[PDB]
Nucleic acid binder design. Sequence first.
RNA 1: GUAACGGGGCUAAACCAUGCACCGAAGCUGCGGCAGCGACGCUUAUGCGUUGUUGGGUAGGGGAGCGUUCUGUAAGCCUG
RNA 2: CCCGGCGAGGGGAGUGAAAAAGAACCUGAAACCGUGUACGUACAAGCAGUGGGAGCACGCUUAGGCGUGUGACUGCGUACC
Lengths: 103, 110, 55, 117, 142
Amino acid sequence: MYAVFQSGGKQHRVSEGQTVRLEKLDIATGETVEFAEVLMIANGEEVKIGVPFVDGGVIKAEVVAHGRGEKVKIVKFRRRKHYRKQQGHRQWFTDVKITGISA
Amino acid sequence: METIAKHRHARSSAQKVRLVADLIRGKKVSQALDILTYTNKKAAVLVKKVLESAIANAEHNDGADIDDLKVTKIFVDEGPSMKRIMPRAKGRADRILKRTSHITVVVSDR
Amino acid sequence: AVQQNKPTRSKRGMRRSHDALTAVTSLSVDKTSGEKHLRHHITADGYYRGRKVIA
Amino acid sequence: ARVKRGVIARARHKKILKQAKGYYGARSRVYRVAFQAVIKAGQYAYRDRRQRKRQFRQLWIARINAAARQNGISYSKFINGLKKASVEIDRKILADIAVFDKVAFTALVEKAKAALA
Amino acid sequence: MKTFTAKPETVKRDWYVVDATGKTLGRLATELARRLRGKHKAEYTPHVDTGDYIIVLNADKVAVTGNKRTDKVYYHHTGHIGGIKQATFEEMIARRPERVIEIAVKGMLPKGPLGRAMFRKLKVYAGNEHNHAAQQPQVLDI
RNA sequence: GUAACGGGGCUAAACCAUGCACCGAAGCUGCGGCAGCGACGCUUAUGCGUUGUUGGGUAGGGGAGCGUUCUGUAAGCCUG
RNA sequence: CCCGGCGAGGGGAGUGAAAAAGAACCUGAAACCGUGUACGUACAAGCAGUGGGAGCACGCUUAGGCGUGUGACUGCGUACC
């Protein structure tokens, strides 16, 4: 069994018991989240395709953690023109655990 | 059980002594002595003396047996240089370097 | 004529890869004294092929 | 008030030389030559953060073409049919399904053909 | 998730056999190169080889259009001063019929070690017989 | 040294007319984050909340910060 | 006390909190030169890196993972003042 859904401007394909990393959400740790815009559900030889959404399809997950990713460096340089510049960056994320797929 | 021997401030070049040092690495002591006896180079004499000193140390300070010894390590390093002057033509002068080396030998039963 | 760029230690080693010395394969044993010597040479005591040649 | 420079200068040079680990020759041994090797690396990283996305989209499209021509349609017609059928699955997921599940891909191709008919 | 990538230790490959009688040179070479590189599989990977082995028979019976039998010229140079040499399509077919198809296909493959390794899976003969019956090739119609 | 299509090769994979798809950029949209300048409401010790818009740069002008040696707070505080 | 030419230089024993404080003697950085181990390299063309990416060796957990070193093959790419 697997399902497709959309979050954070991007799409994911998941099955039960999996941990997924997404953009930051506004929900506290230990709580439950529900995704109710599902694009496809597959259960072996049974395949349901949305046009664009499946009727009565839901994914339930639980929130696990928030955090910050690895650091990146930004470097800018123009030769023979006396110009240089530097910067650093880190990005936020959320982690969820899939508990249920209902078609 | 390992035993050491050193010769410090020896009048030669490390490059010249490493050629002889490479012949006797990992070998039995009797075979090493036989090899060194028939090499027609100046560094053979120095390396031979260091090896003999190492064997004597091993059998006097540590109670070892000659028939079970093996050359487990050997290396050569650089020392200080002496600086001299050599005249050339039309009033020019040049520098001369006299190079020196340190020689180390390690023998063991293992 | 002189170099335009400084060579590398890698090139130094590659050139020196033909400079190794060669050892003697084997030594011979005299039939009377039992000493070791170079093939076709006399011993340090004065023997050659079982006969004393030099006092 | 006379001030010396040794400690700070050494710290700066060491900081720069620690980022050049793994390079060849003087580029990981000498400061003058290793300073230039870090700036260029930064520039290349900045450009590649943008080239990555192009490369991955191209790969997905090639795989989808290969998978569709085995069921009997081409990439352009397949995409047009999905657009007319109102399916909104993206190329990443389409390539994933093309590689790991072929019954579902055949189902999608039939849907597109029916939409185009 | 991260995108799938093929592994050279586990890849399937098959053996095919093709006939070249009365076929157009370039329009055959396109398909040959495509299948040698492996662009017809959903497991295609740019830095891996995922192609098939192909045998070509009757190489001295390919066809060309127009006046190309007398006007197509192959050039090369020897490395000595003045050593430029040329041949015509008819002379090539008379002397070394396999080189025609071989050069045509080689021109259409990636330039580098991987392309040179791709080229090794093509086997061209000038007649109607081959000695690869132990590999059990399948007939392919292009 | 082929050498007046980048190459292979092309009788269309050339040229003219009509139509429908798709590819293609750091352009536009989507999600997350930082900063500058205005307008409007509580009210400011000069803050909060909404909202609109902007952030490629040589010569050169304006604003805000890091680290080093020495003097006071220090007959204090850390340290075999 | 021992090897060595009644050498140069070294190995033990002993002094001292410390001898890698031994007189070439507080601390002992960088260029530069060596010995040992892991991986790669003898059909392959260019500012030597960046994006992707197998295989091999090793450390925690022994559940999926995860970290560290090397890096076949492949897209892009002509130093600084």
